[PDB]
Amino acid sequence: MAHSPPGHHSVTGRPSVNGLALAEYVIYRGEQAYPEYLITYQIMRPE
Amino acid sequence: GTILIDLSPDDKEFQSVEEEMQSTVREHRDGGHAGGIFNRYNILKIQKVCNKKLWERYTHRRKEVSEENHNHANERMLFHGSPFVNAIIHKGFDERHAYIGGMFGAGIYFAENSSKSNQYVYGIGGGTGCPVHKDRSCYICHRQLLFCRVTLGKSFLQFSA
Ligand SMILES: O=c1cc(-c2ccc(-c3nnn[nH]3)cc2)oc2ccccc12
Ligand SMILES: [Zn+2]
């Protein structure tokens, strides 16, 4: 795993082209996330 | 150490998680290549993930981050899609779950858009799709995502395409 940029705990990827996209985020230590819900699903064929 | 507790569809907690999942679907620039073609999901099950050791590890680190950032953990709830979802719920996130080739470096990646994480359930780029039909847009096979509590602390803002 890489290191966080110095003085930061994560990176935020702010989309600057696709106006409909929300943010993506990167952490560099496993201890900074807890997997709280497991969701089981299918994608649905559009009609 | 991990136990999984099923939520009832009647429970407000099931409903709030479902709503976050459905309401954050978007269209993707690959036309559905990685994650398939869809506007919404059929949610089959939502389970709460309970592991005391992994929780205490998370809250320990959260307090350290908070103390380094004016008592602000900057905690978010975000999606993670991965072929390693079973390992993650039993042993926690670590370096094995990093996206070595990700655009912001080798770290663990999370999305606000559920449909973004959906693109990684069968691997990077959607891999070869579902194990049974080798279809990235399979409408039959059961998929799994995680909805995770993530401490961001002071986050480096990267503007990007
Ligand atoms: O949910 C995500 C999972 C992952 C991800 C990436 C690589 C892997 C991986 N590494 N090797 N196989 N799969 C697993 C999950 O990447 C993302 C990138 C952007 C936004 C969200 C995600
Ligand atoms: Zn399938």
Experimental method: X-ray
Spatial distance between the Cα atoms of B152 and B148, rounded to a whole number of angstroms: 12
Q: Which residues of chain A make contact with B26, given a CB cutoff of 8 A?
A: 20-22
Total structural domains within chain B: 1
Smallest Cα–Cα separation from B54: which of B109, B1, B107?
B1
Structural domain containing residue B45:
1-161
Task: Give the burial string for B28-64 (b: 16+ CB within 10 Å, else e).
Answer: beeebebbbbbeebebeebbbbebeebbebbbebbeb
Q: Which domain holds residue A4?
A: 1-47
Phi, psi at B109, each rounded to 5°: -105, 140
List the beta bridge partners of residue A38.
Answer: B47, B146
- Measured between CA atoms, how close is B124 to chain A, in angstroms? 15
Residue from B128, B161, B28, B154 nearest A10 by CA? B154
Please tell me the distance from the alpha carbon of residue B44 to that of residue B46, in angstroms, as a whole number. Answer: 7
Residue B133 burial (CB count, 10 A)? 13
- Bridge partners of B158, per DSSP, are A13
In this structure, the residue with its CA closest to atom 18 of ligand 1 is B109
Q: Whole-angstrom Cα distance, residue A10 to residue A12? A: 7
Number of domains in chain A: 1
Q: Quick check: B76 and A45 CB within 8 A?
A: no
Residue whose C-alpha is closest to residue A11's, from B69, B82, B108, B112:
B108
- What residues contact residue B70 under an 8 Å CB cut-off, 6+ apart? none
Task: Say which ligand is closest to the CA of B79.
Answer: 1
CB-proximal residues (5 Å) to ion ligand 2: B 130, 132-133, 138, 140-141
The CATH number covering residue B1 comes to 3.90.228.10
Q: What CATH code is carried by the domain that includes residue A38?
A: 6.20.320.10
Q: State the DSSP H helix or E strand holding residue B42, giving kind and residue range, or none if neither.
A: strand B41-50
Q: Is B141 annotated as a binding residue?
A: yes
Contact: A1, B113; criterion CB under 8 Å: no
Cα B120 to Cα B53: distance, rounded to the nearest angstrom: 27
Residue in the structure block whose two tokens are 């990684």: B120
Closest among B142, B88, B78 to B116, alpha carbons compared:
B78
